[PDB]
Design a protein around this ligand. Structure first.
Ligand code: HEM
Ligand code: HEM
Ligand SMILES: c1ccc(-c2c[nH]cn2)cc1
Ligand SMILES: c1ccc(-c2c[nH]cn2)cc1
Lengths: 395, 395
């Protein structure tokens, strides 16, 4: 007989409140959206981590959602549609392993470490441009967005003319209020691929195209498009989010930033605590139960859809002492900001490198940077980062 | 019996299509929104102009909305709430003239003429910053937004720290999908006033504070807040919109732009044709009939709410031959982009000067400027301007 959390991003977004309520309403909660869409969420660290590692019980892939294939839910509802896709993240077992295996090389810790000089160069160029500006600056537009999109652009083989197009596209797909986002994103990326087949390069999209051409069985056309999409979705928006979130947190905890700036504390650990404390991905659709599952005296029936509550789990007092305190010296937090199990973030080492470069460089160039104005949230209950991040670079 | 036009901006906005449908469906049409709200719209030039000039028959102000108090529409509906306010634009008669009169001085021809040096200076500084950038630039973020908000900031006495806050706040109020936008905007502006009382200055907000202090009957506290909000709503968003829309139009009509650049056509007339052709305000809530009014053989009952269709009226073939063609040489269009009658845009001369400075200066500095990427629309059925306007300055 579960508690219910009613969500509507049109009536504002409040991630801190949402995280609190999802955690408070036991580990297993019902989440009701607009339309007549109600689903489950798992929101405490221990049950969530357990579910995320047990893919025979909690499977990926919309074909497993009973109510969806039984016409009880509208397939065009944005939330029902968001992970109604054919990429690796919406697969389990051999299909996941096949697809993830094809692209893993490009994202290994060691490959990512070879990207450091170029990431430093892109970071330093951005800082140079910021130094030419004089008064209030949107950190998101100047810094947080351009850095990760440039980095993933070079890895994937994207074109600079599409960077702003992609920013809009991804926001729409993650809004959970845009019925046509997936369809428009698919047609967009299909065109990218068809342009790229004409003019190959040494980027990952070209390599995946080349891999399909060599062996059609290795990767279908639908998988090529959807996996390209997934890499685009993941590739910049969350790192962008995290840069802004991290700067907000460090400047609102000036003592901790002081430790970082004087070499008395670890940037790496601080970034892990930022990931836990203000996780850019609050929750995502879905896990689907393969059988009846009982948690805390509540049974989730076989075939039901379950939101993955990374954000509430990251504030769980069972997992962390004093969870609602930001503390960069805390024992390296084993957080779920990058998820857990088979679908643990492909890009996790790349994001960690990006943040490790971007965050100290910013404060080195602009030691007296301050937060000004308001930073209203992106209107989505799925993601947690600001629409804008106004700063003053010089006192 | 009137036709009905169903609008839902969540399912994607298309102002060109929307204007065509509104115009085509005779001058008097019903417009239905999601939830429980259906209203009227006047969408041809001649009946609209006539309504707008006749304030004893078509009054402003939500207390005149019979259906509202008859509980026939959802109150808290964003569209019902948008002009549920106490500013000059939501009043008629003595109250309108009192409130409008307090601020008119600052917007007369002679006052606006003294703003020219500063507008040119702001324009030239923005162009200097753009010249230090390299590849694709968002013209909106670099030029179209910062110019008007800086200009109105100086006139009103706003703080640069709030500029980006205001951009979001205004977008929310004009979305017509945000129930909490007016309330949050009022709270925000009430704080502005409380800050401003401490430190008065030479700007219009201070003058309105000073006016209330000297004679409380000249201006209530509610009126002070709502009118400050109104001036902020009006003060930059539409000029910003018009800059981008005008650049789109001139670069997609390169022959006409050529004539302007060689002194074979008038910038002033071109700007009037931009205003007519891609009017930034498509329609707004609410004339309310003071009696039964018959137009085109259709009676609008007393007390009913009527959308003001500036944009469809501006494409009316009865008002202009070949309305759907952009033609900077046409006789100066007598358009409704600024409205008509007692509420004719207080800022109209300021907007015309801003555009007259901004548009030629842009093309003089960046003669080979080119449109690239996508420019998706702001998601509102009320306003007509892009979310982003990617350009290459020095292709
Ligand atoms: C830096 C570039 C990034 C890329 C290219 C990227 C890409 C991906 C991909 C492809 C997956 C799916 C993995 C699989 O199915 O095996 C994934 C999962 C995930 N990523 Fe990322 N990601 C990046 C950064 C981030 C960051 C900074 C965060 C969080 C702050 C994040 C959060 C997640 C989460 C939570 C999942 C698991 C989703 C789930 O279990 O349903 N990612 N990422
Ligand atoms: C191109 C730029 C602009 C456009 C297209 C525009 C359009 C309009 C329109 C259509 C109206 C009439 C609304 C109605 O009748 O319901 C109006 C009224 C108004 N506008 Fe603007 N406007 C612009 C710029 C500005 C500026 C720069 C200001 C500066 C404060 C401003 C302040 C006002 C005010 C205060 C009113 C209400 C006047 C009254 O109630 O008497 N506008 N504008
Ligand atoms: C849908 C698909 C992938 C993501 C993602 C992966 N990594 C970051 N974000 C978010 C939403
Ligand atoms: C609501 C109220 C006023 C406006 C306006 C007036 N002038 C510019 N914008 C827009 C929307």
């Amino acid at each position: 007989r579960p508690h219910t959390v009613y969500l509507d991003p049109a009536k504002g977004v409040d991630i801190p409140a949402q995280r609190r309520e999802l955690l408070d309403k036991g580990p297993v909660v019902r989440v009701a959206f607009p339309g007549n869409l109600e689903v489950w969420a798992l929101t405490h660290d221990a049950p969530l981590r357990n579910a995320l590692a047990d893919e025979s019980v909690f499977v990926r892939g919309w074909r497993n959602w009973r109510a969806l294939m039984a016409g009880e839910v509208d397939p065009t509802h944005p939330v029902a549609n968001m992970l109604r896709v054919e990429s690796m993240l919406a697969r389990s077992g051999a299909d996941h392993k096949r697809m993830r295996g094809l692209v893993q090389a490009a994202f290994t810790r060691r490959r990512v470490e070879a990207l450091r000089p170029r990431i430093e160069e892109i970071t330093n160029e951005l800082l140079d441009r910021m130094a030419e500006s004089d008064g209030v600056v949107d950190l998101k537009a100047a810094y947080s967005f351009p850095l990760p999109i440039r980095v993933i652009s070079e890895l994937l083989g994207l074109n600079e003319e599409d960077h702003l197009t992609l920013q809009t596209l991804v926001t729409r797909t993650l809004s959970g209020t845009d019925p046509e986002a997936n369809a428009d994103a698919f047609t967009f990326v299909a065109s990218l691929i068809e342009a790229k087949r004409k003019n190959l390069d040494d980027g990952l999209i070209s390599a995946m195209i080349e891999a399909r051409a060599e062996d059609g069985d290795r990767l279908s056309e639908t998988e090529l498009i959807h996996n390209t999409l997934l890499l685009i979705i993941g590739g910049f928006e969350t790192t962008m989010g995290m840069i802004s979130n991290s700067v907000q947190l460090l400047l609102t905890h000036p003592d901790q930033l002081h430790l970082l700036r004087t070499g008395q504390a670890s940037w790496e650990n601080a970034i892990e605590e930022c990931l836990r404390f203000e996780s850019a991905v609050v929750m995502l659709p879905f896990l689907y139960t393969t059988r009846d599952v009982e948690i805390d005296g509540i049974t989730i029936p076989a075939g039901d859809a379950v939101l993955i509550g990374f954000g509430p789990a990251n504030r769980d007092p069972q997992a962390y002492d004093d969870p609602d305190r930001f503390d960069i010296t805390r024992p390296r937090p084993r957080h779920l900001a990058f998820g857990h199990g088979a679908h643990l973030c492909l890009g996790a080492a790349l994001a960690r490198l990006e943040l490790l470069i971007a965050l100290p460089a910013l404060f080195e160039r602009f030691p007296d940077i301050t937060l000004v104005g308001e930073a209203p949230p992106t209107p989505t209950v799925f993601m947690n980062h600001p629409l804008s991040r106004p700063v003053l670079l010089r006192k």
